[PDB]
Design a protein around this ligand. Sequence first.
Ligand SMILES: *[C@@H]1O[C@H](CO)[C@@H](O[C@@H]2O[C@H](CO)[C@@H](O)[C@H](O)[C@H]2NC(C)=O)[C@H](O)[C@H]1NC(C)=O
Ligand SMILES: *[C@@H]1O[C@H](CO)[C@@H](O[C@@H]2O[C@H](CO)[C@@H](O)[C@H](O)[C@H]2NC(C)=O)[C@H](O)[C@H]1NC(C)=O
Ligand SMILES: *[C@@H]1O[C@H](CO)[C@@H](O[C@@H]2O[C@H](CO)[C@@H](O)[C@H](O)[C@H]2NC(C)=O)[C@H](O)[C@H]1NC(C)=O
Ligand SMILES: *[C@@H]1O[C@H](CO)[C@@H](O[C@@H]2O[C@H](CO)[C@@H](O)[C@H](O)[C@H]2NC(C)=O)[C@H](O)[C@H]1NC(C)=O
Ligand SMILES: *[C@@H]1O[C@H](CO)[C@@H](O[C@@H]2O[C@H](CO)[C@@H](O)[C@H](O)[C@H]2NC(C)=O)[C@H](O)[C@H]1NC(C)=O
Ligand SMILES: *[C@@H]1O[C@H](CO)[C@@H](O)[C@H](O)[C@H]1NC(C)=O
Ligand SMILES: *[C@@H]1O[C@H](CO)[C@@H](O)[C@H](O)[C@H]1NC(C)=O
Ligand SMILES: *[C@@H]1O[C@H](CO)[C@@H](O)[C@H](O)[C@H]1NC(C)=O
Lengths: 49, 250, 146, 49
Amino acid sequence: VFNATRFASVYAWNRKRISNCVADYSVLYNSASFSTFKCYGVSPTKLND
Amino acid sequence: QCVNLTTRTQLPPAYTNSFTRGVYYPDKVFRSSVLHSTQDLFLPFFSNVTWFHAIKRFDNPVLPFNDGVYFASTEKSNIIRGWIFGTTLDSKTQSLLIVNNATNVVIKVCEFQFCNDPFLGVYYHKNNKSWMKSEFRVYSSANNCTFEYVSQPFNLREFVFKNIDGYFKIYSKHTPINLVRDLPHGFSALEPLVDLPIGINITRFQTLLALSSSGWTAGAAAYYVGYLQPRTFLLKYNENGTITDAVDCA
Amino acid sequence: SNNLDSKVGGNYNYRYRLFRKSNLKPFERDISTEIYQAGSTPCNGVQGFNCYFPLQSYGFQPTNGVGYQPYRVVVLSFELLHAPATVCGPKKSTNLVKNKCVNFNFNGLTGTGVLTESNKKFLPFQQFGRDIADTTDAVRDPQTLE
Amino acid sequence: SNNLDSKVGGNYNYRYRLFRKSNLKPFERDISTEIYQAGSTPCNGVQGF
Ligand SMILES: *[C@@H]1O[C@H](CO)[C@@H](O[C@@H]2O[C@H](CO)[C@@H](O)[C@H](O)[C@H]2NC(C)=O)[C@H](O)[C@H]1NC(C)=O
Ligand SMILES: *[C@@H]1O[C@H](CO)[C@@H](O[C@@H]2O[C@H](CO)[C@@H](O)[C@H](O)[C@H]2NC(C)=O)[C@H](O)[C@H]1NC(C)=O
Ligand SMILES: *[C@@H]1O[C@H](CO)[C@@H](O[C@@H]2O[C@H](CO)[C@@H](O)[C@H](O)[C@H]2NC(C)=O)[C@H](O)[C@H]1NC(C)=O
Ligand SMILES: *[C@@H]1O[C@H](CO)[C@@H](O[C@@H]2O[C@H](CO)[C@@H](O)[C@H](O)[C@H]2NC(C)=O)[C@H](O)[C@H]1NC(C)=O
Ligand SMILES: *[C@@H]1O[C@H](CO)[C@@H](O[C@@H]2O[C@H](CO)[C@@H](O)[C@H](O)[C@H]2NC(C)=O)[C@H](O)[C@H]1NC(C)=O
Ligand SMILES: *[C@@H]1O[C@H](CO)[C@@H](O)[C@H](O)[C@H]1NC(C)=O
Ligand SMILES: *[C@@H]1O[C@H](CO)[C@@H](O)[C@H](O)[C@H]1NC(C)=O
Ligand SMILES: *[C@@H]1O[C@H](CO)[C@@H](O)[C@H](O)[C@H]1NC(C)=O
């Protein structure tokens, strides 16, 4: 999803579906690679809960 | 592909006596040398299970799916190969596809536009003296997908299906009786194999059977359908904690 | 993503929708390349007065200002809590002590006890033992199955 | 109390607490203003990311 080869163009934006698995973000929010991560109704902490 | 092989006019329904079946481990709990009672959705003892054939014959109806189903087949040549469970069966909603293909078992949930007469077809021993699959004639489209599993690739066969609380629980036993004909009374239980959290409604189901677009042979097989019901069963566990005998209290 | 997605002449592979007949709706996707009508005039053919092609390409360059640089977006979207739950958060585990009194949990079987290596055998699908009183008396480790 | 308190440009003179380590105890008052650390980082001084 993030470290994918190349990204899609916004006139044509990709939708990738996800299922049947576990969402550990420990290598995601705790990484300084993103200049902006905002959640709009949950704490990024609480996501692993 | 998608084709109507509508030749067999509907006939009158057949029946038999499901003496001591549809006992399955109700929950994943170890218990031993102990007689645990439980109300759950069970096939009523000695009930008139509805009986079906392929032969000349290729019976495959859109049965009800109400309060869970026991399904089984007595089999050669692995004829019964999946089931279409759903609630419109024409992509106006999702529906569940279960299939056993010659490469793998696959289970999928999408807004499937099914065939009027959905099936799978294989050339019969022809020309190369190998059999091979070719006609996948079950659905025309799949647009909005939710679940998609495929197995790592590659008689009496018993199954139970419950869509309770949006979990589709499958219980099964493959017991290779060499007894040649009667539905053989005597006792055993189904283990759960898999659970799918699909959340979809189901109201009807249909079985899938293995068959130039028309005129063919249906390989001979027999299969049986009985709906489960809320009852109370007293379950004898043995030392090992297998369900070794039962009483239907009613 | 200026160190990825910019190209020294401009990365015109990346594109937006500069024109439309009305402002679009939440999560809509539009692939149209049919020419836009900016006035009251019916625009016909590949060009004309008040004819515009509704797409445009970004001039993403490694020399752009902090703003005209390119920036990746992943929206982790999900609709919620109107079905069974097929994706959840991580459930961290700790080492398995024995012969001590503990507040145990196994798969959500929270409880309290002393844990000891059973000689009971279970059939593979079973996760926990009960007893004659229909109280719980045993559990399988979901990691290192015993 | 709008006709007593509410200015045209708005009373900012009344405040509430949005961040706190823990939910406070009954009849407890908090005069804290020390910077809350949402990130895993420490965050000494008046401000930070
Ligand atoms: C398979 O046969 C059925 C009928 O046996 C076809 O359904 C008909 O479809 C037409 C339009 O093509 C409707 O006007 C009729 O009312 C339908 N009749 C019935 C009884 O279904 C169906 O189209 C056929 N499928 C294919 C792929 O040919
Ligand atoms: C059995 O069904 C599966 C699922 O549709 C088929 O697997 C696909 O086969 C092609 C060609 O080998 C692969 O490119 C796809 O990636 C496979 N899909 C998946 C999800 O693995 C399989 O080919 C089918 N076999 C038969 C004989 O019908
Ligand atoms: C699959 O789901 C999408 C989204 O619910 C459906 O797209 C909608 O289609 C209807 C009818 O054309 C429109 O009124 C909506 O505006 C569409 N919604 C969005 C967000 O695209 C799509 O039709 C569904 N497909 C099937 C086969 O059920
Ligand atoms: C419970 O299951 C076990 C395992 O199949 C049975 O024990 C086996 O019995 C044979 C015959 O005496 C021995 O040769 C094996 O070595 C035993 N295996 C083990 C693991 O003990 C046991 O008899 C079964 N008991 C009941 C009442 O079903
Ligand atoms: C996740 O679970 C499996 C157990 O099902 C762990 O794999 C086992 O590792 C032990 C110790 O090296 C071996 O004795 C077992 O034979 C392994 N089991 C299998 C299935 O090969 C796996 O390591 C676990 N992961 C973590 C991080 O604990
Ligand atoms: C089973 O069907 C037969 C008809 O063949 C009927 O007479 C009998 O009452 C039925 N029994 C049950 C339990 O449904
Ligand atoms: C068998 O015949 C089919 C066509 O009828 C052909 O495509 C296939 O390759 C043949 N198989 C072998 C092993 O030659
Ligand atoms: C299934 O039907 C029930 C009753 O109409 C409804 O509450 C539920 O939302 C439906 N779910 C789906 C996936 O159609």
